[PDB]
Amino acid sequence: ITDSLAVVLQRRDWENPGVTQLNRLAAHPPFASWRNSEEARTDRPSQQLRSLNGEWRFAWFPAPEAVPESWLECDLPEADTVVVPSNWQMHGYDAPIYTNVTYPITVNPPFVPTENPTGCYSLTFNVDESWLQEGQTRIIFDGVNSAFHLWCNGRWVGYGQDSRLPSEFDLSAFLRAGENRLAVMVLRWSDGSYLEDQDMWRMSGIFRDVSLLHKPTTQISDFHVATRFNDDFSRAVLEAEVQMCGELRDYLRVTVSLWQGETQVASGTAPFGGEIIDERGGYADRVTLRLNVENPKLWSAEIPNLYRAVVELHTADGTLIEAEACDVGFREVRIENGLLLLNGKPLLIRGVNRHEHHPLHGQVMDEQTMVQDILLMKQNNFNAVRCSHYPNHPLWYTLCDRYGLYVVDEANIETHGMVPMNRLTDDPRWLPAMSERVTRMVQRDRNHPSVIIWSLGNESGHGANHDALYRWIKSVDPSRPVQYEGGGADTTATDIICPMYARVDEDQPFPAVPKWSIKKWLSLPGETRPLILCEYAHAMGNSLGGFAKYWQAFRQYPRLQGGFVWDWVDQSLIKYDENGNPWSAYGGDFGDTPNDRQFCMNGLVFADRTPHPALTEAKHQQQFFQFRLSGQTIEVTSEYLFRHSDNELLHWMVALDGKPLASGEVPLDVAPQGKQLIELPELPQPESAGQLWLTVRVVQPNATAWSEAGHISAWQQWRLAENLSVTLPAASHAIPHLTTSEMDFCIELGNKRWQFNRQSGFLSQMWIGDKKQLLTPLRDQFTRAPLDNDIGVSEATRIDPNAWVERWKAAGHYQAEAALLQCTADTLADAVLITTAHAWQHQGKTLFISRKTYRIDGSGQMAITVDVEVASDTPHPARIGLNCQLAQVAERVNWLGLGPQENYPDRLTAACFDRWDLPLSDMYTPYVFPSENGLRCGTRELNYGPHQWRGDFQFNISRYSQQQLMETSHRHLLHAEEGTWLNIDGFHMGIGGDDSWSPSVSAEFQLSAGRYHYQLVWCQK
């Protein structure tokens, strides 16, 4: 009766931050209740721990109030059979909302909307009579979003908030032998939502596991581990504090044993009863053991040395009541003298922020996915990850512990959408709610070695609540530093200056919360903390420009210990078309309102875990070996702090314009922080013209746990020499004929013919034989289909006049009209010479001026020479080159320049100069939100079909015009055009990326010279 919906729902606990839970057990590290020490030691599975994951019955309602009392007693006819865990939006019930800042619901704390999507889950299951004789049977939900009430066998059990941490209830007295039934009612919105405003899809449900754990009556209630070291780490102390619940009987003992493999390293036994703590005594229900470990193997992301710790609760006669365990990693984390140290050396964090996202499963995580992510990261030169912005699925820590990644664990607290940001975090009334989001995290994850820093949440301004919570942590677990960026990045609530999007060299001095240039921030008066960016280098779409600038500061300034790139995966979701064809969806694609569109796609990898090209630029910049070339000696520097180059080979090689002349291989013997000298054999040197390039690669000959054999971990290339070509071509056998007309000029020579339209001034067509080559005339191009960064936050509604695109738009770039100023043909001794001039103007303003000369010679080669003039007072153009639509469509593209991957000017350090050959398909980058892409810089020669262009340029080539790109919201809607679109740039502006909501292109990468010159040679084979 008092179990009635009617009664229960009445209190509206989900509209009250003063009730965060009802009858929930305390937090603690992961338990299994093994009843045999070996299983515990070997991490075998505990029969005392049962999963309730699977098929559950579910029914959706628009408001908690629309639930029928019947539900409590019996299933529902119309209840569907759903799989758990899952996100009900993933099943169709309601839509997922992709909003960033702006809260999904209306801001009226602590109220929530009356229309509040309720999901009723139920499960019928069996409890074995043995579980009811003794012990305690409790239930666990690893993640319920956002809040929920619970009934068992028609009785009300409890309530819980906090989507990202476990809620546990003792079912001990509601359970009946055999058949039991659970009724779980999950509310989408609650007062907890006010604290969960992270930039991500807004979903709901029982999205993490459900389990049953059977514990003895007298049991281990919690335990913590700690490791102290001596000056040189040659000796450690493992300290374990154990607490128990139940009746304390003198025959009770505890044994803590430390294994390393099969080998027991240390063991300790004792009975309950701690040291005197105060005037009343000590804890009789606790015991602390201390094990001495000589020459412990240390844990690090470089070498994840782990031990196993077993905690046995037994009686003195040797009888085991129960056992728990955890992996142990010996490491010390400290900030000392402005530096963050790990095991005494200073880290350089090569990290990334990662959300729990699956395109198919929404926010439900699985082992496979976790592992994939981990390996990609490790393969790509990452050390660390930040749990943006809440505690993750438990297994995560374990994997990191094991594979080796540093983890920053973060409280599930984000109130980004309040005004001001502080509003709740400065309010004592939210102190409790917040408090639980921090404390429980710590109680749960504190024993993992991978966790090296605690974070108070994200973007919730800076309030007195943070200060308190930060102090709490420091008191409770001084083993790790605390960080929080809110309120300016350097408040009293953080041990590290941890801004987001601070530029390297430029300051952004917003009122109250400026973002100084990182190099400058450190030397502000009185400042002494280390600086590590919590988010930097916004990887949204065609991005990552300038990435290297960061890497270089990091390397030059000690107190700049790296940062976390934003972010790992694109938060795109899968949708299906008219023919059961899938496609990547984003903000607002689910009729979701209000929404932030593409803003959910900032990953380095696509939702399927396939990489964006940016990923390489990272990989290379973050590489652990560094090179310098001096004469014919290569100096190698190791950035490893703990390990020796012991699975590393260096391959070297010399080549002249793509042609290999020499190769070597040399095994690296460099210690962490060491140098290795490498002298090269006498290097060949040819008479032939061209550039000679040295390229080196570090290879991992043997496979590791996260890499295959032959994995390349680093590389670098240098230009060694140049033999300039002092050779004049063979005087043409033939001579081209010029046929004039009033419409055009024709040039014929051989089967070849070229036509220039005298009215437009462009080369309108060309034939090889009877076949035409163009579909579109060759013409000047000064624009580009806007990248995400060019656009920023500019919308049709709300225009951002500062966004590059807006400027360009406003100035007429996109709609300027050419103007023939001149077009002449002249006959040279051995060639024809065409000469043109256009002016591009908009509203009587001449933006640019293009002046060319085409010169066709007996060789049947045309040489284009171009010279642009850009008005000082017009926004600098995105680019400067030509384009045209070719008639042909070939299978491959071959070029001699940077590649193989897409590379832009402020994003090309990872690319190598060489001869690349790839399929056309590979020259297009499927950024879900179409834009200019696929560029390759420093090209010297490009070959497509019978064409060959030569010079110094950047280019791109696909089946999509710039216009089509520019006009398609999703990549799935693009259609291949008639032939091949070719864009050949003499120059291209950088892509930026410091952030994606303001101009981020550094000046060095802006086409601001005024005068631009370039030349090409088009010809055939």
Instruction: Give me the residues that bind a second copy (CB under 8 A), please.
Output: 2, 6-7, 10-11, 16, 18-22, 26, 275-284, 418-423, 428-429, 431-432, 435-436, 439-440, 443, 459, 461-462, 464-465, 467-472, 474-476, 486-488, 492, 510-513
- Nearest-approach distance from CB 498 to a second copy, in angstroms: 15
271 binds, among Mg ion, a second copy, none (CB under 5 to 8 A by kind): none
Distances (CA, A) of 750 to 313, 711, 736, 771: 95, 51, 8, 13
**Within the chain, how many helices (H) and strands (E) appear?**
14, 58
**Distance between CA 445 and CA 30 in Å, rounded?**
8
- The residues binding Mg ion (CB under 5 A) are 13, 16, 19, 191, 199, 416
Residue among 18 and 582 whose Cβ is closer to a second copy:
18
CB of 815 to Mg ion, least distance (A): 36
| 429 interface partner picked from a second copy, Mg ion, none, CB below 5 to 8 A per type | a second copy
Task: Write down the catalytic residue from 535, 617, 648, 806.
Answer: 535
At residue 14, the 3 state secondary structure works out as: helix
Helix (H, G, I), strand (E, B) or coil at 605: strand
DSSP secondary structure code for residue 681 in this structure = P
For residue 260, how many other CB atoms are within 10 A of its CB?
A: 16
Consult the annotation and say whether 599 binds a ligand.
yes
279: annotated binding-site residue? no
Q: Please tell me whether 997 is known to bind a ligand.
A: yes
Nearer to Mg ion, 277 or 689 (CB): 277
3-state per-residue secondary structure call for 740-756: ECCCEEEEEECCEEEEE
Q: What minimum distance in Å lies between the beta carbon of 804 and Mg ion? A: 23
Q: How far is the CB of 32 from a second copy (least distance, A)?
A: 23
| Closest distance to a second copy from the beta carbon of 632 (Å) | 54
What is the C-alpha separation between 958 and 980, in angstroms, rounded? 6
Give which of a second copy, Mg ion, none residue 191 binds (C-beta under 5 to 8 Å, depending on kind).
Answer: Mg ion
Distances (CA, A) of 582 to 87, 577, 971, 972: 19, 6, 12, 9
Helix H or strand E encompassing 688:
none
Cβ–Cβ < 8 Å for 470, 496? no
Helix-strand-coil percent breakdown of the chain, rounded to 5?
15, 40, 45
- DSSP notation for 7-53: HHGGG-GGG-TT-SEESPPPP-S----BSSHHHHHTT---TTEEE--
Look at the block and give the residue holding tokens 């493999």: 261
Q: Give yes or no for a contact between 819 and 834, defined as CB atoms under 8 angstroms apart.
A: no
Fill in the amino acid letter for 401: D
CA 885 from centroid of its chain's CA atoms: 36
- 239 labelled ligand-binding: no
Which of 473/522 has CB closer to a second copy? 473
CA distance 670 to 672: 7
**Nearest to a second copy of 234, 492 (CB atom):** 492
Return the number of the residue (13 or 436) whose C-beta is nearest Mg ion: 13
Closest alpha carbon to 143 in 98, 99, 102, 87: 87
Contact 951, 1014 (CB under 8 A): yes
Q: Are 600 and 526 in contact, with CB atoms under 8 Å apart?
A: no
Out of a second copy, Mg ion, none, which partner does residue 199 contact, by CB within 5 to 8 A per kind?
Answer: Mg ion
Q: How far is the CB of 168 from a second copy (least distance, A)?
A: 13
Shortest gap between Cβ of 240 and a second copy (angstroms)? 18
From a second copy, Mg ion, none, interface partner of 707 (C-beta below 5 to 8 A by class): none
Instruction: Check whether 537 is labelled as a binding-site residue.
Output: yes
- Residue 536, annotated as binding a ligand: yes
Work out what residue 319 binds among Mg ion, a second copy, none; the CB cut-off runs from 5 to 8 Å by kind.
Answer: none
Nearer to a second copy, 8 or 182 (CB): 8
Chosen from a second copy, Mg ion, none, partner binding at 30 (C-beta under 5 to 8 Å by type) = none
Both structure tokens of 145: 């979003």
292 close to 305: Cβ distance less than 8 angstroms:
no
Biggest CA-to-CA distance, the chain: 113
Beta carbon nearer to Mg ion, 494 or 621: 494
Question: Residue 445, SS3?
Answer: helix
Q: Is 100 annotated as a binding residue?
A: yes
Q: What kind and span of H or E run contains 38?
A: helix 37-41
Supply the minimum distance, in Å, between the C-beta of residue 29 and a second copy.
14
Q: Which does 746 bind (CB under 5 to 8 A by kind): Mg ion, a second copy, none?
A: none
Minimum CB distance to a second copy smaller for 250 or for 891: 250
Residue nearest to Mg ion (CB): 199
Q: If you ran DSSP here, which 8-state letter would residue 454 be given? A: E
Taken as a whole, the chain contains a residue count of: 1021
- Cβ proximity to a second copy: between 209 and 485 the closer is 485
Residue 199, annotated as binding a ligand: yes
Establish whether 416 is an annotated binding residue.
yes
748 is catalytic: no
> Least separation, in Å, of the C-beta of 608 and Mg ion?
25
Residue 542, both tokens:
């065609």
Question: Is 312 part of the annotated catalytic residue set?
Answer: no
**From 459, 485, 902, 932, active-site residue:** 459
Annotated binding residue at 757?
no
Residue 372 interacts with, from Mg ion, a second copy, none (CB under 5-8 Å by kind): none
C-alpha distances (whole Å) from 509 to each of 514, 534, 585 are 4, 18, 36
Tell me 497's DSSP state: B
Residues annotated in a binding site: 100, 199, 414, 416, 459, 535-538, 595, 599, 602, 997
Residues annotated in a binding site for Na(+): 199, 599, 602
Residues annotated in a binding site for Mg(2+): 414, 416, 459, 595
Active site residues: 459, 535
Residues annotated in a binding site for substrate: 100, 199, 459, 535-538, 602, 997
